[PDB]
Amino acid sequence: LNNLQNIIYNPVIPFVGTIPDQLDPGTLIVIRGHVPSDADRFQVDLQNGSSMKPRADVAFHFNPRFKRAGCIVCNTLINEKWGREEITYDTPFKREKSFEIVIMVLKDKFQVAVNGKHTLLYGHRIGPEKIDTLGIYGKVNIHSIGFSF
Ligand SMILES: OC[C@H]1O[C@@H](O[C@H]2[C@H](O)[C@@H](O)[C@H](O)O[C@@H]2CO)[C@H](O)[C@@H](O)[C@H]1O
Ligand code: NA
Ligand code: NI
């Protein structure tokens, strides 16, 4: 890390907020918090705007789910239609456990690590320059949101 500057502490979920700079290659988004014991799922959405009707495009939907053995669904929403799901079954998330999510923006893809260990990759389907909004929804508690540009 270093260069990480945390804004937003303990936001009310759902949280929707504008990202303070363009997500150029090398940028980090760092989200710390924990999963409550009654959690079915939560999501971190990198969005093109904050429109609700029509629902803003989600360039990167990062969606841990905890039913059964749990997983992480990643996907992209365009014109309120979901695309092809990229499912990661080796999920490090567990109910009643803390996490640090680090999303690293590369030229061709996102690289995501959780609690210091690599978790997944997701190739860009929308140009990252169109991402200006971070949403966090569902059953999750967030201590901090920060960025490293
Ligand atoms: O793709 C993310 C999107 O998934 C929706 O649910 C899917 C589900 O993940 C898939 O495995 C199942 O087979 O069909 C559903 C069809 O939409 C969620 O409703 C949505 O919240 C997004 O998370
Ligand atoms: Na959704
Ligand atoms: Ni805590």
Side-chain angles (χ1 to χ4, degrees), residues 1-66 69-149:
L1 298 175
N2 304 11
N3 294 341
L4 178 61
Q5 304 190 352
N6 290 322
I7 329 298
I8 319 306
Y9 297 92
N10 300 292
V12 164
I13 305 303
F15 167 88
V16 186
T18 307
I19 297 177
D21 202 350
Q22 183 172 277
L23 305 188
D24 284 323
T27 303
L28 305 175
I29 307 163
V30 179
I31 300 169
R32 295 165 179 154
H34 21 72
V35 184
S37 62
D38 77 312
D40 45 8
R41 56 175 265 165
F42 74 88
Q43 59 204 82
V44 174
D45 290 339
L46 308 184
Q47 303 179 7
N48 184 359
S50 52
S51 177
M52 285 182 309
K53 202 186 175 292
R55 179 176 175 183
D57 295 349
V58 182
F60 183 41
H61 174 65
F62 175 88
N63 174 219
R65 306 178 177 186
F66 306 91
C71 61
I72 302 171
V73 180
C74 298
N75 208 345
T76 289
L77 180 80
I78 299 175
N79 189 30
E80 303 176 300
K81 315 301 210 323
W82 287 111
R84 186 243 177 190
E85 290 188 341
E86 306 185 21
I87 299 183
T88 290
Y89 287 99
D90 197 343
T91 172
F93 298 100
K94 178 48 165 157
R95 299 174 179 169
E96 282 188 293
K97 204 219 293 285
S98 286
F99 58 82
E100 165 179 279
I101 291 163
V102 182
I103 307 173
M104 184 184 3
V105 179
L106 304 177
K107 174 211 185 180
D108 289 335
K109 73 201 88 163
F110 302 100
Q111 178 180 318
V112 178
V114 178
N115 302 334
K117 168 175 172 40
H118 171 76
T119 296
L120 62 82
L121 302 171
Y122 187 87
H124 291 311
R125 308 194 189 170
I126 306 177
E129 72 277 0
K130 300 192 187 182
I131 303 171
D132 71 353
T133 302
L134 168 67
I136 303 180
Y137 316 86
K139 291 273 176 185
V140 70
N141 303 119
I142 302 297
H143 281 320
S144 66
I145 300 177
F147 300 90
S148 169
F149 292 105

PDB file of all heavy atoms in Angstrom, residues 61-80, unseen atoms left out:
ATOM      1  N   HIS A  61     -19.306  -5.679 -11.171  1.00  0.00           N
ATOM      2  CA  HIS A  61     -20.127  -6.200 -10.079  1.00  0.00           C
ATOM      3  C   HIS A  61     -19.323  -7.294  -9.371  1.00  0.00           C
ATOM      4  O   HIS A  61     -19.070  -8.353  -9.952  1.00  0.00           O
ATOM      5  CB  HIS A  61     -21.432  -6.733 -10.682  1.00  0.00           C
ATOM      6  CG  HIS A  61     -22.351  -7.448  -9.735  1.00  0.00           C
ATOM      7  ND1 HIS A  61     -22.968  -6.825  -8.665  1.00  0.00           N
ATOM      8  CD2 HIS A  61     -22.852  -8.709  -9.774  1.00  0.00           C
ATOM      9  CE1 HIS A  61     -23.765  -7.688  -8.059  1.00  0.00           C
ATOM     10  NE2 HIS A  61     -23.708  -8.841  -8.707  1.00  0.00           N
ATOM     11  N   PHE A  62     -18.893  -7.033  -8.134  1.00  0.00           N
ATOM     12  CA  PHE A  62     -18.122  -7.977  -7.315  1.00  0.00           C
ATOM     13  C   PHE A  62     -19.046  -8.468  -6.200  1.00  0.00           C
ATOM     14  O   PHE A  62     -19.381  -7.710  -5.286  1.00  0.00           O
ATOM     15  CB  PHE A  62     -16.856  -7.298  -6.776  1.00  0.00           C
ATOM     16  CG  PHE A  62     -16.041  -8.140  -5.807  1.00  0.00           C
ATOM     17  CD1 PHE A  62     -15.059  -9.004  -6.269  1.00  0.00           C
ATOM     18  CD2 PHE A  62     -16.230  -8.026  -4.432  1.00  0.00           C
ATOM     19  CE1 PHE A  62     -14.288  -9.760  -5.362  1.00  0.00           C
ATOM     20  CE2 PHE A  62     -15.458  -8.773  -3.522  1.00  0.00           C
ATOM     21  CZ  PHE A  62     -14.497  -9.637  -3.989  1.00  0.00           C
ATOM     22  N   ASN A  63     -19.479  -9.732  -6.271  1.00  0.00           N
ATOM     23  CA  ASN A  63     -20.645 -10.170  -5.500  1.00  0.00           C
ATOM     24  C   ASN A  63     -20.393 -11.463  -4.728  1.00  0.00           C
ATOM     25  O   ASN A  63     -20.706 -12.568  -5.210  1.00  0.00           O
ATOM     26  CB  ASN A  63     -21.849 -10.286  -6.436  1.00  0.00           C
ATOM     27  CG  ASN A  63     -23.079 -10.866  -5.765  1.00  0.00           C
ATOM     28  OD1 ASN A  63     -23.811 -11.650  -6.386  1.00  0.00           O
ATOM     29  ND2 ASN A  63     -23.314 -10.499  -4.505  1.00  0.00           N
ATOM     30  N   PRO A  64     -19.835 -11.366  -3.520  1.00  0.00           N
ATOM     31  CA  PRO A  64     -19.765 -12.547  -2.647  1.00  0.00           C
ATOM     32  C   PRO A  64     -21.149 -12.988  -2.194  1.00  0.00           C
ATOM     33  O   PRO A  64     -22.006 -12.170  -1.851  1.00  0.00           O
ATOM     34  CB  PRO A  64     -18.899 -12.075  -1.466  1.00  0.00           C
ATOM     35  CG  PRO A  64     -18.070 -10.946  -2.050  1.00  0.00           C
ATOM     36  CD  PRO A  64     -19.009 -10.251  -3.011  1.00  0.00           C
ATOM     37  N   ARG A  65     -21.365 -14.312  -2.241  1.00  0.00           N
ATOM     38  CA  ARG A  65     -22.581 -14.985  -1.802  1.00  0.00           C
ATOM     39  C   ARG A  65     -22.180 -16.088  -0.830  1.00  0.00           C
ATOM     40  O   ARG A  65     -21.143 -16.733  -1.016  1.00  0.00           O
ATOM     41  CB  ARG A  65     -23.350 -15.587  -2.988  1.00  0.00           C
ATOM     42  CG  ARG A  65     -23.675 -14.602  -4.116  1.00  0.00           C
ATOM     43  CD  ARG A  65     -24.392 -15.292  -5.285  1.00  0.00           C
ATOM     44  NE  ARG A  65     -24.747 -14.315  -6.317  1.00  0.00           N
ATOM     45  CZ  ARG A  65     -25.477 -14.584  -7.393  1.00  0.00           C
ATOM     46  NH1 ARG A  65     -25.936 -15.816  -7.604  1.00  0.00           N
ATOM     47  NH2 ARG A  65     -25.749 -13.618  -8.261  1.00  0.00           N
ATOM     48  N   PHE A  66     -23.003 -16.309   0.201  1.00  0.00           N
ATOM     49  CA  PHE A  66     -22.617 -17.172   1.313  1.00  0.00           C
ATOM     50  C   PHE A  66     -23.473 -18.421   1.497  1.00  0.00           C
ATOM     51  O   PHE A  66     -23.136 -19.255   2.348  1.00  0.00           O
ATOM     52  CB  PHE A  66     -22.621 -16.368   2.619  1.00  0.00           C
ATOM     53  CG  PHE A  66     -21.775 -15.139   2.548  1.00  0.00           C
ATOM     54  CD1 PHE A  66     -22.321 -13.931   2.148  1.00  0.00           C
ATOM     55  CD2 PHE A  66     -20.425 -15.204   2.833  1.00  0.00           C
ATOM     56  CE1 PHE A  66     -21.534 -12.797   2.064  1.00  0.00           C
ATOM     57  CE2 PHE A  66     -19.635 -14.082   2.749  1.00  0.00           C
ATOM     58  CZ  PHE A  66     -20.192 -12.876   2.358  1.00  0.00           C
ATOM     59  N   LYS A  67     -24.565 -18.574   0.749  1.00  0.00           N
ATOM     60  CA  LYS A  67     -25.333 -19.810   0.798  1.00  0.00           C
ATOM     61  C   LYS A  67     -24.477 -20.984   0.332  1.00  0.00           C
ATOM     62  O   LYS A  67     -23.616 -20.849  -0.543  1.00  0.00           O
ATOM     63  CB  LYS A  67     -26.590 -19.688  -0.066  1.00  0.00           C
ATOM     64  N   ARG A  68     -24.712 -22.143   0.938  1.00  0.00           N
ATOM     65  CA  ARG A  68     -23.985 -23.392   0.623  1.00  0.00           C
ATOM     66  C   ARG A  68     -22.497 -23.152   0.912  1.00  0.00           C
ATOM     67  O   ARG A  68     -22.148 -22.569   1.951  1.00  0.00           O
ATOM     68  CB  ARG A  68     -24.295 -23.832  -0.792  1.00  0.00           C
ATOM     69  N   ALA A  69     -21.600 -23.578   0.028  1.00  0.00           N
ATOM     70  CA  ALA A  69     -20.175 -23.359   0.232  1.00  0.00           C
ATOM     71  C   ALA A  69     -19.729 -21.946  -0.122  1.00  0.00           C
ATOM     72  O   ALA A  69     -18.542 -21.644   0.019  1.00  0.00           O
ATOM     73  CB  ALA A  69     -19.368 -24.367  -0.588  1.00  0.00           C
ATOM     74  N   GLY A  70     -20.638 -21.081  -0.579  1.00  0.00           N
ATOM     75  CA  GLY A  70     -20.291 -19.714  -0.936  1.00  0.00           C
ATOM     76  C   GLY A  70     -19.525 -19.585  -2.241  1.00  0.00           C
ATOM     77  O   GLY A  70     -18.954 -20.563  -2.730  1.00  0.00           O
ATOM     78  N   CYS A  71     -19.519 -18.392  -2.828  1.00  0.00           N
ATOM     79  CA  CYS A  71     -18.792 -18.129  -4.066  1.00  0.00           C
ATOM     80  C   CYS A  71     -18.698 -16.618  -4.238  1.00  0.00           C
ATOM     81  O   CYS A  71     -19.194 -15.850  -3.410  1.00  0.00           O
ATOM     82  CB  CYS A  71     -19.480 -18.755  -5.285  1.00  0.00           C
ATOM     83  SG  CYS A  71     -21.145 -18.141  -5.596  1.00  0.00           S
ATOM     84  N   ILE A  72     -18.078 -16.199  -5.335  1.00  0.00           N
ATOM     85  CA  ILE A  72     -18.097 -14.801  -5.740  1.00  0.00           C
ATOM     86  C   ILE A  72     -18.519 -14.753  -7.195  1.00  0.00           C
ATOM     87  O   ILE A  72     -17.828 -15.302  -8.058  1.00  0.00           O
ATOM     88  CB  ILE A  72     -16.738 -14.118  -5.569  1.00  0.00           C
ATOM     89  CG1 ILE A  72     -16.272 -14.187  -4.121  1.00  0.00           C
ATOM     90  CG2 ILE A  72     -16.832 -12.666  -6.033  1.00  0.00           C
ATOM     91  CD1 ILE A  72     -14.872 -13.732  -3.967  1.00  0.00           C
ATOM     92  N   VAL A  73     -19.636 -14.095  -7.469  1.00  0.00           N
ATOM     93  CA  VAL A  73     -20.064 -13.837  -8.836  1.00  0.00           C
ATOM     94  C   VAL A  73     -19.555 -12.459  -9.244  1.00  0.00           C
ATOM     95  O   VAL A  73     -19.746 -11.481  -8.518  1.00  0.00           O
ATOM     96  CB  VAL A  73     -21.597 -13.935  -8.950  1.00  0.00           C
ATOM     97  CG1 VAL A  73     -22.055 -13.668 -10.363  1.00  0.00           C
ATOM     98  CG2 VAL A  73     -22.081 -15.326  -8.493  1.00  0.00           C
ATOM     99  N   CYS A  74     -18.872 -12.384 -10.386  1.00  0.00           N
ATOM    100  CA  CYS A  74     -18.547 -11.118 -11.018  1.00  0.00           C
ATOM    101  C   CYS A  74     -19.264 -11.032 -12.359  1.00  0.00           C
ATOM    102  O   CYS A  74     -19.453 -12.046 -13.047  1.00  0.00           O
ATOM    103  CB  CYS A  74     -17.041 -10.954 -11.199  1.00  0.00           C
ATOM    104  SG  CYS A  74     -16.127 -10.931  -9.632  1.00  0.00           S
ATOM    105  N   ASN A  75     -19.673  -9.820 -12.729  1.00  0.00           N
ATOM    106  CA  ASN A  75     -20.495  -9.625 -13.921  1.00  0.00           C
ATOM    107  C   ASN A  75     -20.522  -8.134 -14.255  1.00  0.00           C
ATOM    108  O   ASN A  75     -19.961  -7.298 -13.537  1.00  0.00           O
ATOM    109  CB  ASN A  75     -21.908 -10.185 -13.709  1.00  0.00           C
ATOM    110  CG  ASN A  75     -22.566 -10.628 -15.004  1.00  0.00           C
ATOM    111  OD1 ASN A  75     -22.119 -10.280 -16.097  1.00  0.00           O
ATOM    112  ND2 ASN A  75     -23.654 -11.374 -14.881  1.00  0.00           N
ATOM    113  N   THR A  76     -21.168  -7.812 -15.376  1.00  0.00           N
ATOM    114  CA  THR A  76     -21.310  -6.446 -15.863  1.00  0.00           C
ATOM    115  C   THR A  76     -22.766  -6.230 -16.240  1.00  0.00           C
ATOM    116  O   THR A  76     -23.378  -7.094 -16.883  1.00  0.00           O
ATOM    117  CB  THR A  76     -20.413  -6.203 -17.079  1.00  0.00           C
ATOM    118  OG1 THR A  76     -19.044  -6.172 -16.675  1.00  0.00           O
ATOM    119  CG2 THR A  76     -20.783  -4.913 -17.783  1.00  0.00           C
ATOM    120  N   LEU A  77     -23.322  -5.099 -15.824  1.00  0.00           N
ATOM    121  CA  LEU A  77     -24.696  -4.717 -16.129  1.00  0.00           C
ATOM    122  C   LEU A  77     -24.690  -3.572 -17.132  1.00  0.00           C
ATOM    123  O   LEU A  77     -24.042  -2.543 -16.897  1.00  0.00           O
ATOM    124  CB  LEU A  77     -25.442  -4.306 -14.858  1.00  0.00           C
ATOM    125  CG  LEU A  77     -26.906  -3.884 -15.002  1.00  0.00           C
ATOM    126  CD1 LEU A  77     -27.812  -5.100 -15.094  1.00  0.00           C
ATOM    127  CD2 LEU A  77     -27.325  -2.995 -13.862  1.00  0.00           C
ATOM    128  N   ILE A  78     -25.399  -3.754 -18.251  1.00  0.00           N
ATOM    129  CA  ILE A  78     -25.508  -2.740 -19.297  1.00  0.00           C
ATOM    130  C   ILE A  78     -26.955  -2.696 -19.766  1.00  0.00           C
ATOM    131  O   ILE A  78     -27.537  -3.738 -20.091  1.00  0.00           O
ATOM    132  CB  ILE A  78     -24.578  -3.032 -20.489  1.00  0.00           C
ATOM    133  CG1 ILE A  78     -23.109  -3.049 -20.065  1.00  0.00           C
ATOM    134  CG2 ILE A  78     -24.799  -2.024 -21.607  1.00  0.00           C
ATOM    135  CD1 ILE A  78     -22.180  -3.457 -21.181  1.00  0.00           C
ATOM    136  N   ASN A  79     -27.540  -1.496 -19.799  1.00  0.00           N
ATOM    137  CA  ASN A  79     -28.953  -1.342 -20.157  1.00  0.00           C
ATOM    138  C   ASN A  79     -29.829  -2.246 -19.293  1.00  0.00           C
ATOM    139  O   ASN A  79     -30.770  -2.880 -19.774  1.00  0.00           O
ATOM    140  CB  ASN A  79     -29.184  -1.633 -21.642  1.00  0.00           C
ATOM    141  CG  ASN A  79     -30.595  -1.285 -22.094  1.00  0.00           C
ATOM    142  OD1 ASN A  79     -31.214  -0.368 -21.552  1.00  0.00           O
ATOM    143  ND2 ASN A  79     -31.112  -2.021 -23.087  1.00  0.00           N
ATOM    144  N   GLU A  80     -29.490  -2.337 -18.010  1.00  0.00           N
ATOM    145  CA  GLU A  80     -30.245  -3.134 -17.047  1.00  0.00           C
ATOM    146  C   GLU A  80     -30.289  -4.626 -17.402  1.00  0.00           C
ATOM    147  O   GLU A  80     -31.113  -5.368 -16.854  1.00  0.00           O
ATOM    148  CB  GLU A  80     -31.668  -2.582 -16.869  1.00  0.00           C
ATOM    149  CG  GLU A  80     -31.666  -1.121 -16.433  1.00  0.00           C
ATOM    150  CD  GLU A  80     -33.042  -0.516 -16.339  1.00  0.00           C
ATOM    151  OE1 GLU A  80     -33.759  -0.476 -17.364  1.00  0.00           O
ATOM    152  OE2 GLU A  80     -33.406  -0.091 -15.222  1.00  0.00           O
TER     153      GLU A  80
END
